Amino acid sequence: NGPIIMTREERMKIVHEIKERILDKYGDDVKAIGVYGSLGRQTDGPYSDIDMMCVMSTEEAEFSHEWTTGEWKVEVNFDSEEILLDYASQVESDWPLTHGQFFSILPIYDSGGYLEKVYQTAKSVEAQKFHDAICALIVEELFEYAGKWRNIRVQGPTTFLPSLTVQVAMAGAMLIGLHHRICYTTSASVLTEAVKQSDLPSGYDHLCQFVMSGQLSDSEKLLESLENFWNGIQEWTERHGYIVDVSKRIPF
Amino acid sequence: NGPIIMTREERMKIVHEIKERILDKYGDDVKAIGVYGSLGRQTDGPYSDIDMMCVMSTEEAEFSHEWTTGEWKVEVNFDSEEILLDYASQVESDWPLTHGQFFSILPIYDSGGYLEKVYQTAKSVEAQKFHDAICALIVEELFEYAGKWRNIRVQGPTTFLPSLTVQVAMAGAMLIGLHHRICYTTSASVLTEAVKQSDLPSGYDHLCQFVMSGQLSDSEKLLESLENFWNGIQEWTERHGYIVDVSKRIPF
Numbered sequence: 471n472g473p474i475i476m477t478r479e480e481r482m483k484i485v486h487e488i489k490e491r492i493l494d495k496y497g498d499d500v501k502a503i504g505v506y507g508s509l510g511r512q513t514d515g516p517y518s519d520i521d522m523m524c525v526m527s528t529e530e531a532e533f534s535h536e537w538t539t540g541e542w543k544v545e546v547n548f549d550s551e552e553i554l555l556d557y558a559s560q561v562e563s564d565w566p567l568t569h570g571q572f573f574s575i576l577p578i579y580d581s582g583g584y585l586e587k588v589y590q591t592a593k594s595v596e597a598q599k600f601h602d603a604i605c606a607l608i609v610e611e612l613f614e615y616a617g618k619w620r621n622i623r624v625q626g627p628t629t630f631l632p633s634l635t636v637q638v639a640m641a642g643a644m645l646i647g648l649h650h651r652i653c654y655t656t657s658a659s660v661l662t663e664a665v666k667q668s669d670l671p672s673g674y675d676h677l678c679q680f681v682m683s684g685q686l687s688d689s690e691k692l693l694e695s696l697e698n699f700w701n702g703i704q705e706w707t708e709r710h711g712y713i714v715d716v717s718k719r720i721p722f
Numbered sequence: 723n724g725p726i727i728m729t730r731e732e733r734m735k736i737v738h739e740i741k742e743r744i745l746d747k748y749g750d751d752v753k754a755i756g757v758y759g760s761l762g763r764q765t766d767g768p769y770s771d772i773d774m775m776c777v778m779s780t781e782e783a784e785f786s787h788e789w790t791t792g793e794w795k796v797e798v799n800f801d802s803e804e805i806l807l808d809y810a811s812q813v814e815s816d817w818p819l820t821h822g823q824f825f826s827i828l829p830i831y832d833s834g835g836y837l838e839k840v841y842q843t844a845k846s847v848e849a850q851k852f853h854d855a856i857c858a859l860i861v862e863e864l865f866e867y868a869g870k871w872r873n874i875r876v877q878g879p880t881t882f883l884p885s886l887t888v889q890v891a892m893a894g895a896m897l898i899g900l901h902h903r904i905c906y907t908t909s910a911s912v913l914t915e916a917v918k919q920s921d922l923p924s925g926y927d928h929l930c931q932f933v934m935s936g937q938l939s940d941s942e943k944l945l946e947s948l949e950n951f952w953n954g955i956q957e958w959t960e961r962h963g964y965i966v967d968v969s970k971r972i973p974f
């Protein structure tokens with residue numbers, strides 16, 4: 471019957487019950503336990519699931535328990551300090567959506583400031599890593615989407631266009647977030663927060679209005695909006711120095 | 723302003739240049755080279771990218787080169803035989819979308835039947851792996867989506883509902899593909915092929931109609947369609963035995 475309505479108090483009880491269970495089972499291998507996500511920001515809605523992180527001392531520790539009771543869902547990730555710190559300092563194309571975890575840490579157990587160290591690492595990532603992630607995003611994702619919607623324009627199918635438009639709008643949101651080196655609060659607010667930022671590529675806000683309103687049935691307006699956004703990207707990358715190497719047929 | 727229009731003959735010319743370049747650089751470390759994706763089953767549209775794969779003899783080989791010339795995009799993955807076969811034999815929630823690669827391999831170099839060996843491995847995966855992936859999908863993705871759209875109904879934002887509905891429809895497509903052990907052709911045909919399968923959970927095809935048509939502006943009809951799909955999931959999982967024990971507050 472799906473998730474039920476729960477209050478913040480009930481969630482913190484579950485959190486502290488899980489904390490006790492983790493300490494009973496693993497004992498001194500537990501370096502730190504925190505809550506992240508919406509419950510960590512104390513923004514959590516009545517239906518939100520629970521996300522917790524655990525720093526282990528045992529080397530190469532990397533596992534997780536993800537379950538539901540039928541009424542609520544919990545995910546607990548267990549990582550060694552080294553594994554967690556490397557993850558916090560790696561910038562992938564979906565960094566603005568995944569690494570909000572490290573800017574929403576609610577500590578409930580920490581034997582040696584480990585969670586603070588993870589937070590510091592996540593916020594001190596070198597600027598060059600965001601630059602590379604932006605160039606990789608344009609090649610590995612945006613360029614590929616451009617071929618996908620241009621294929622639709624000539625040979626269809628248009629039934630993929632609304633889903634692909636959503637993907638392009640989400641990828642554009644990642645590109646902006648990588649530029650500003652900021653993580654989005656929640657998944658539901660990614661597009662709302664993306665259009666309120668500075669230095670938007672031309673055509674991005676117009677494209678997002680289709681995705682946020684759900685008016686994705688006019689394929690011609692979508693294709694025309696995607697091309698304008700695709701065009702706006704390339705002046706935007708030159709204006710900010712995110713220059714993509716296009717000089718070789720084969721780069722190895 | 724790429725990607726540009728290309729013919730199959732122009733793509734195979736680029737492919738064989740890369741094959742020549744791969745053999746020049748890595749020589750006898752190359753066990754096999756193949757083309758997958760749309761060019762692999764030679765359906766490729768006028769704008770499709772080029773996807774290639776390489777089997778290496780080097781033990782820990784796992785790297786990729788992904789680039790564009792401004793006109794076309796190429797991705798070449800280099801994997802040891804052990805790494806590639808283990809990947810082909812592991813079933814994640816996005817198996818129906820990622821592992822079609824292994825059912826579309828066009829060999830252009832193969833020193834010892836390595837590519838046929840990859841195809842055999844990918845198609846002989848134990849039924850238990852698909853069963854576990856289905857149960858994990860329902861918990862890790864579907865249950866989480868249900869909480870998210872129920873939050874939207876109570877506290878918004880409505881601007882996330884069209885994007886979240888697309889995500890739910892794609893997760894349902896994964897659920898169907900894992901059930902029937904089938905991989906989807908391309909990203910563009912995932913939804914069309916998913917709704918043509920048997921044993922659909924009640925409410926999925928109706929939900930896909932909103933996503934495929936792009937009529938995602940009636941949040942009220944979307945939430946009702948999402949709930950109906952969510953109900954159909956619980957009957958569908960019971961009828962096929964994709965049952966997870968949910969009786970414990972903490973299952974470890």
Ligand SMILES: NC[C@@H]1O[C@H](O[C@H]2[C@@H](O)[C@H](O[C@@H]3[C@@H](O)[C@H](N)C[C@H](N)[C@H]3O[C@H]3O[C@H](CN)[C@@H](O)[C@H](O)[C@H]3N)O[C@@H]2CO)[C@H](N)[C@@H](O)[C@@H]1O
Pocket residue numbers: 610611759773784785788797799800801805806809820823
């Ligand atoms: N190649 C065999 C195995 O691949 C894995 O990585 C897989 C996955 O993470 C990785 O995903 C990569 C991303 O990361 C990278 N940032 C952009 C790139 N386009 C994407 O590639 C994949 O996603 C694309 C669609 N978006 C597809 O067009 C493409 O065919 C597909 N290879 O591609 C691999 C799938 O083939 C592991 N690296 C390793 O277990 C072994 O190498």
Ligand SMILES: NC[C@@H]1O[C@H](O[C@H]2[C@@H](O)[C@H](O[C@@H]3[C@@H](O)[C@H](N)C[C@H](N)[C@H]3O[C@H]3O[C@H](CN)[C@@H](O)[C@H](O)[C@H]3N)O[C@@H]2CO)[C@H](N)[C@@H](O)[C@@H]1O
Pocket residue numbers: 507521532533536545547548549553554557568571862863866
């Ligand atoms: N935990 C720290 C690091 O996590 C990484 O994996 C990351 C990522 O793949 C992984 O993704 C996992 C999946 O895989 C798994 N099959 C289902 C699970 N819902 C999902 O979890 C993630 O996606 C959810 C939304 N769908 C989010 O609600 C959730 O907060 C998020 N942790 O979450 C991790 C981020 O926390 C690496 N394993 C490793 O570098 C290190 O352990």
Ligand SMILES: [Mg+2]
Pocket residue numbers: 519521545866
């Ligand atoms: Mg989660």
